[PDB]
Design an enzyme around this catalytic site. Structure first.
Site, PDB file in Angstrom:
ATOM      1  N   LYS A 257       8.484   6.026  30.142  1.00 16.45           N
ATOM      2  CA  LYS A 257       9.544   5.028  30.191  1.00 16.45           C
ATOM      3  C   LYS A 257       9.142   3.956  31.191  1.00 16.45           C
ATOM      4  CE  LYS A 257      10.794   6.486  27.205  1.00 16.45           C
ATOM      5  NZ  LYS A 257      11.295   6.056  25.853  1.00 16.45           N
TER       6      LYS A 257
ATOM      7  N   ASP B 164       6.168   3.025  26.727  1.00 14.56           N
ATOM      8  CA  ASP B 164       7.322   2.467  26.022  1.00 14.56           C
ATOM      9  C   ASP B 164       8.195   1.669  26.968  1.00 14.56           C
ATOM     10  OD1 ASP B 164       9.544   1.863  24.553  1.00 14.56           O
ATOM     11  OD2 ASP B 164      10.007   3.970  24.045  1.00 14.56           O
TER      12      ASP B 164
ATOM     13  N   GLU C  76       4.387   0.203  23.403  1.00 19.18           N
ATOM     14  CA  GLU C  76       5.569   0.297  22.532  1.00 19.18           C
ATOM     15  C   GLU C  76       6.718  -0.642  22.988  1.00 19.18           C
ATOM     16  OE1 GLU C  76       7.008   4.207  21.194  1.00 19.18           O
ATOM     17  OE2 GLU C  76       9.083   3.542  21.366  1.00 19.18           O
TER      18      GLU C  76
ATOM     19  N   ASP D 103      10.039  -0.534  17.829  1.00 19.38           N
ATOM     20  CA  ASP D 103      11.098   0.467  17.883  1.00 19.38           C
ATOM     21  C   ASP D 103      12.478  -0.199  17.721  1.00 19.38           C
ATOM     22  OD1 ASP D 103      12.967   2.461  18.560  1.00 19.38           O
ATOM     23  OD2 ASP D 103      11.871   3.136  20.335  1.00 19.38           O
TER      24      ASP D 103
ATOM     25  N   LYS E  63      14.648   5.765  15.014  1.00 20.77           N
ATOM     26  CA  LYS E  63      15.756   6.489  15.636  1.00 20.77           C
ATOM     27  C   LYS E  63      16.861   6.651  14.612  1.00 20.77           C
ATOM     28  CE  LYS E  63      15.080   4.380  20.179  1.00 20.77           C
ATOM     29  NZ  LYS E  63      13.978   5.216  20.661  1.00 20.77           N
TER      30      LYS E  63
HETATM   31 MG   LIG Z   1      10.937   3.778  22.186  1.00 23.64          MG
END
Ligand SMILES: [Mg+2]
Ligand SMILES: [Cl-]
Ligand SMILES: [Cl-]
Ligand SMILES: [Cl-]
Ligand SMILES: [Mg+2]
Ligand SMILES: [Mg+2]
Ligand SMILES: [Mg+2]
Ligand SMILES: [Mg+2]
Ligand SMILES: [Mg+2]
Ligand SMILES: [Mg+2]
Ligand SMILES: [Mg+2]
Ligand SMILES: [Mg+2]
Ligand code: NI
Ligand code: NI
EC number: 4.2.1.171
Lengths: 361, 351, 369, 361
Positions: free
Chosen positions: A159, A187, A212, A235, A259
């Site tokens: 993250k 990401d 990402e 994403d 997602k």
């Molecule tokens: Mg992501």
């Protein structure tokens, strides 16, 4: 023939084994606010689903604005269910997704088929997993990742999307503690402006890493994709088939993260999944977050995807300490599988779910 | 569940108004359930359907017919192209999935979106008075969408399109289907000469590139058929704004699995479909009706009732035209049962 | 004087490998290839020959069946036709059957063999004229452990081969090691192509080309589609080669206009015969694109077709060719090319200049008359 | 086999109509054509003819540079002949063409085959012809087009590319005296700037006409292509495989004109023709001008082109009054064909050609 007689909404806290989860823009959560939906029919069958965004008020107020209009309808006509909701409410895919998923659970129960069959057929016995690594100090992130690697995870998603220098350090420190064959995705969850992102991908251009979702918009992100040779993932900006097709036609990415609830349920996720396969775009099959019931949906969509086009999935249930369902997928040496039981294959534990905070009938 | 045998049947399908070579496929399982499908190209070509099935079948014995994604991967690995041989296998597995789950195909394809579906009428080029009387009859039985065959001599086609547009109600739709028969210069002349008519132009040329060249020069609503052969060419057309509608032929694109994905892409991009196939009898018509029923009306330009055009019934429970429209039952799978007296003995068995 | 086709005979012949096995992308491999030889008979007594051998085993039901069933579907439409009217032959085939380039290729090549025989000229003349006395060859290197690829390459370079095609497109990390290992054993002047044969997704391809960016290597056909491959092309400065996705003059034209590659591989049978391959060849020359002249696989008769097409290509635009016949153990024709010090040539005999060895081809598995 | 001598002949070709006029005020009354004869040591001879629209002095002095390099070479090796010519002299397609063509005639002779077989095989028994109509007063062009239509010609190229207003009147007058089924191409031969072309194509937009080569450059011509719904033809800017491919890829035209000598001979023309067939582009198979020998080459190339991609050819020998070879094509009812004799199938009338004007040995 079958009709929806009630929609019940449950609330459950999902605390974290690590105590905190942090990501871009300084955001963090200590205890996640999960919502479980139960759809009851006039023939005894019940369908279940879970939505847990990173919001939860909006899931439940969204459900308020959707559920009454589904009473009496046929849960097995999933196209018609989705039509109603889209006509009922603009946006709120997080309220919509669990209705859609509970209906697929019912479809599986009514047909005696596990979801992976109904989503297109089992394409793999089990599925590759990544572990998300909370945004912290570089050396702490490195230490946690060694732990998870030792449990057998071979894919990891940091993250980042914080301060650019911090992230350069984080990506370096975590890449340095992995073995060569382990896979590392950085990401940003949209947390960089393009000049920030340029600096980060510049400084990690010789590392074996994936970039990402660097920025908030599609256009900002493509500006980054065009300046790196590193494999690139979109994403948040890929929310449906239309944006997906655009990203395909314009060579905006090498992989996507899908997602399930963010795109509005299994019906939508499945469409995107089939599109990607058609264009050789591997996917990370995941969701915003969740427990046993979120993990079951993930595993079924993932199992119905060829290994070739499964970049990874993750197993949110093992991140938490509270079990909300029996029969959920479990992780073995970094991989997840399901049973062959009908629908999601799961059975809620009503004692932890408590009393429905809302009923519609 | 395991596929235990694939049987291949041949059946002549005469026209009411010369004879088509249809192939029917039967899949048998170790549990007693059987799946059926039909494929009938325009013809020659029927030989390739049956040779393709011959090359495919051995690879399918022992496989799980309900894992439709795996059936398709296996077929694609064993044999390149041959969508007309792959399609009945895929459809017969969809029929098995309906049977094994006790669900009609339209539910398994995403849910009923339409109680019944529109059809269209091809208008033969005849003396203006014979056309006008037939049109009156077509209009009386519910038809409002019409097609004429073009793609021959450019000047003759210009005339025919003017003639046919004249004898129709202003509210009627008219599609001029050139069926790839024009070169760029011919096509330019034709669409140029009908620019002020309320007409659709369908598939003017042989390739995507040629067709796009015509697209860029006409404002008329524009339909592609032959060149949209899969999800990949479709996405290309979508991204390049190459067409306003498509003709989706289930067998030419390789089955329901592929047709379904194409169908969903079209919906998302506001592209209505004419849902049919190259030709067929009762069992092709069932596949068409189930797919059309799972499409909203907004994105169904029409479907087609091929069985209306033949004289031999090959299955019971097939869709049937009533008042210019067609539906299906809610019986499991395709909802049909083949009439084996008509099908004869298998021309091939694989086990 | 108007020659006509009186029959088409189709032979099947097993072709084993000297190396015992051949492995490429997606875990594919074969140990014994299933080859097809076509004999076109005429009312004048002259015959034309061709061979077609797609990547597949004689021991399983594979792609060779589709070559032979395609010939079954074409043949009736060819009886009575004039085989020297090669344009019409191809028009008759295209009307009769969609696709099946592997079935149509050998008919086209056998008609060229008949044109050469009717005219007393070697193929290389009819294809445009001899531009080279002999042609440079590459060796295809089976996908194995880097150390085994490296060791086989040294052996073949010692036999005089100066160009090499690695069969990569496996696991990306393995492929990175394979490319380094083999590049390291070759002198700088030897050329090294990393041929993925469509075996990578774009993220895999991105990692591989990034990791070899500083090596003197060519990257060939990284991904399955044209679009995926062009995405790799735009992210690498390395010289870039297209193969499988260049299936004809139309995709070739598209790739030229869009700067999608620096070289192509031309597989004669995959593009549907010498007529199609020649058009593509001449188009490549006019646009400065070197070609590898090859085919999917085969024995002596495939090798002869390759050699004639290569001989009629200027050296400047012949990146390489390959001699499939020295990869196998079973000779199927006299008069075929034979590699000498890493190069092959042809004779000036008419047509392909070959005569099949029927002791080996055996009885036809089909006759159509 | 090897070349032992190359002879160059000169012959005047007068016009039946006494004059031919085209864009920019250009006109010619008597054409200056060149015939090449290549002698080999086996006694076979190859023939060709080149007659560009001075240009002739250019052809012959080009040959003066090329020929000595060819003495001794194999003329059946058409590729090596072309390479030797290209290394000797840069450009000069008109000087190289009759050499290339004369070698194709030799190949036919050495193999016992007519050129239509060696160029790819007979695709038509005979071929459609157009008549070029000289740039004159509208009513004169109209009266001449009627007479040619009465002879059986069903296709016509107007020579426009003069004053825009005059051209608009020309195109109207000629279209109106033709049967509906006759084709009418308005060939400006580059004679308009784009504001002129725009006015012309605007003014004839409802006529059944084709627009050919309005302007000098490809770019100017495409600008007209994009403004009109009329079918569109390029000619002078399509000078080789490279500009052809650019045009195809950019959708610059619906048809082309292929002038055999202008593009450098049968070898380059065949390549261009075969590429046009692959992309569905019909062609007008012609040359700059000529007599019986140019006509024979046109006819052999046309015959190996399917009818579907032969927009037309033209028979130059019927425009003039001097016969230079036996065995040539002769128009019959607006069509021509060839014999099946080897090569071009013609034999020069040495009597008409006279003593060679140059010899190389
Ligand atoms: Mg992501
Ligand atoms: Cl119909
Ligand atoms: Cl022989
Ligand atoms: Cl005037
Ligand atoms: Mg930020
Ligand atoms: Mg009636
Ligand atoms: Mg036509
Ligand atoms: Mg159509
Ligand atoms: Mg791979
Ligand atoms: Mg290759
Ligand atoms: Mg001017
Ligand atoms: Mg012109
Ligand atoms: Ni709200
Ligand atoms: Ni086949």
């Amino acid at each position: 023939h079958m009709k929806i007689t009630a929609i019940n909404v449950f609330q459950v806290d999902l605390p974290l084994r690590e105590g905190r989860y942090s990501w871009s823009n300084g955001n963090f959560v200590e205890v996640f606010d999960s919502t479980v939906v139960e759809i009851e029919t006039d023939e005894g069958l019940k369908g279940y689903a879970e939505c847990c965004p990173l919001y939860a008020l909006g899931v439940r107020s969204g459900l308020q604005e959707l559920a009454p209009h589904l009473i009496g309808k046929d849960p097995l006509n999933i196209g018609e269910i989705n039509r109603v909701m889209d006509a009922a409410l603009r946006g709120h895919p997080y309220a919509k997704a669990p209705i859609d998923i509970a209906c697929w659970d019912l479809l599986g129960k009514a047909t005696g088929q596990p979801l992976y069959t109904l989503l297109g057929g089992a394409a793999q016995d089990d599925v590759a997993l990544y572990r998300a690594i909370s945004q912290e100090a570089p050396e702490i992130m490195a230490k946690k990742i060694e732990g998870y690697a030792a449990e057998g995870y071979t894919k990891f998603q940091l993250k980042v999307g914080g301060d650019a220098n911090d992230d350069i350090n984080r990506i370096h420190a975590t890449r340095s503690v992995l073995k060569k064959s382990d896979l590392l995705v950085a990401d940003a969850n949209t947390g960089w402006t393009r000049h920030e992102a340029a600096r980060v991908v510049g400084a990690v251009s010789s590392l074996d890493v994936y970039i990402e979702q660097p920025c908030l918009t599609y256009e900002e992100s493509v500006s980054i994709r065009r300046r790196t040779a590193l494999p690139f993932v979109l994403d948040e900006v890929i929310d449906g088939p239309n944006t997906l097709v655009r990203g395909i036609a314009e060579d905006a990415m090498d992989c996507i993260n899908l997602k399930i609830s963010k795109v509005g349920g299994l019906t939508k996720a499945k469409l995107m999944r089939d599109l990607c396969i058609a264009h050789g775009i591997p996917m990370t099959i995941e969701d915003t977050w969740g427990g046993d019931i979120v993990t079951a949906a993930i595993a079924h969509l993932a199992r119905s995807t060829p290994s070739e086009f499964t970049f990874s999935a993750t197993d949110f249930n093992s991140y938490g300490t509270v079990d909300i369902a029996e029969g959920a997928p479990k992780r073995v040496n970094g991989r997840m599988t399901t049973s062959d039981l009908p629908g999601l294959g799961i059975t809620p534990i009503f004692d932890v779910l408590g009393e429905p905070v809302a009923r519609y009938s």
